[PDB]
Design a protein around this ligand. Structure first.
Ligand SMILES: CCCC[C@H](N)P(=O)(O)O
Ligand SMILES: [Mn+2]
Ligand SMILES: [Mn+2]
Ligand code: NA
Length: 261
């Protein structure tokens, strides 16, 4: 759908809160901490301080407040008090908050302790694939072109793109039309228009693109157990570009990307 200025302002607030959770949890992602603990810290912050609520909790039965995925886990990892972080781990924390009826969805990678060279490389390329997509967003561009650009870049840098999970429209609903694929698909044909709000959240594997879903029905892993990274931002298409609603202080791209001269 097409969001109104009123809707957009509310999404700015929800997006900002979601981003602030990631900025807050940052210093706690250390060797020795459990993902279950990281989840409690995030949830307490969201409920007690932001006076908001996690959109993940209860969604199709999801048991926790945030998704935390480690190394070969592609996405939707479930926080667990028994799972401790250790040196070298690459960790994605995916946050989705609901405030004033609107959603804000974002995630970023964190490397624990001493980084591994390929670990740093994978995360770097993944974030750049997101940035590349974001600098492309403007009315007139087709989602298929965006997905094609992401895939071309990722593959050009020696990695693979996960096909089964994608970005999505977002607003008063967690997942709304359209689907935002991170690769070139014949199924995709959507011309962007101002007012559309959606996410871009490429999942990149160091090895092959194939994945597998665990018995819990949530945890997704790379079929070859290679590392997988992901970054996500929620945006709104503007008259001549886009505006990132979940920008953080550490992002190396501005909130508003305009294509004017
Ligand atoms: C708890 C369900 C997972 C929802 C994730 N934020 P996404 O749909 O962006 O992977
Ligand atoms: Mn997400
Ligand atoms: Mn999402
Ligand atoms: Na991973």
């Amino acid at each position: 759908s097409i969001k109104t200025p009123e809707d957009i302002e509310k999404m700015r607030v929800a997006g900002r809160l979601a981003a602030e959770v990631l900025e807050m949890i940052e210093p706690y992602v250390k060797p020795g901490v459990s993902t279950g603990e990281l989840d409690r810290i995030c949830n307490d912050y969201i409920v007690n301080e932001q006076h908001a609520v996690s959109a993940c909790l209860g969604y199709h039965g999801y048991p926790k407040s945030v998704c935390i995925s480690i190394n070969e886990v592609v996405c939707h990892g479930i926080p667990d008090d028994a799972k401790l972080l250790k040196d070298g781990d690459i960790v994605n924390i995916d946050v989705t908050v609901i405030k004033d009826g609107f959603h804000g969805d974002t995630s970023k990678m964190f490397i624990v302790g001493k980084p591994t060279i390929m670990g740093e490389r994978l995360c770097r390329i993944t974030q750049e694939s997101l940035y590349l997509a974001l600098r492309m967003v403007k009315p007139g561009i087709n989602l298929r072109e965006i997905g094609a650009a992401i895939q071309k870049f990722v593959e050009a840098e020696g990695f693979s793109v996960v096909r089964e999970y994608c970005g999505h429209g977002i607003g008063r609903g967690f997942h709304e039309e359209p689907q935002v694929l991170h690769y070139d698909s014949r199924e995709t044909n959507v011309v962007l228009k101002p007012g559309m709000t959606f996410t871009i959240e490429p999942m990149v594997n160091a090895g092959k693109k194939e994945i597998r879903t665990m018995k819990d029905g949530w945890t997704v892993k790379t079929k070859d157990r290679s590392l997988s990274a992901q970054y996500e931002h929620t945006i709104v298409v503007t008259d001549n570009g886009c505006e990132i609603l979940t920008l953080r202080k550490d992002d190396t791209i501005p909130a508003i990307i305009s294509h004017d001269e």
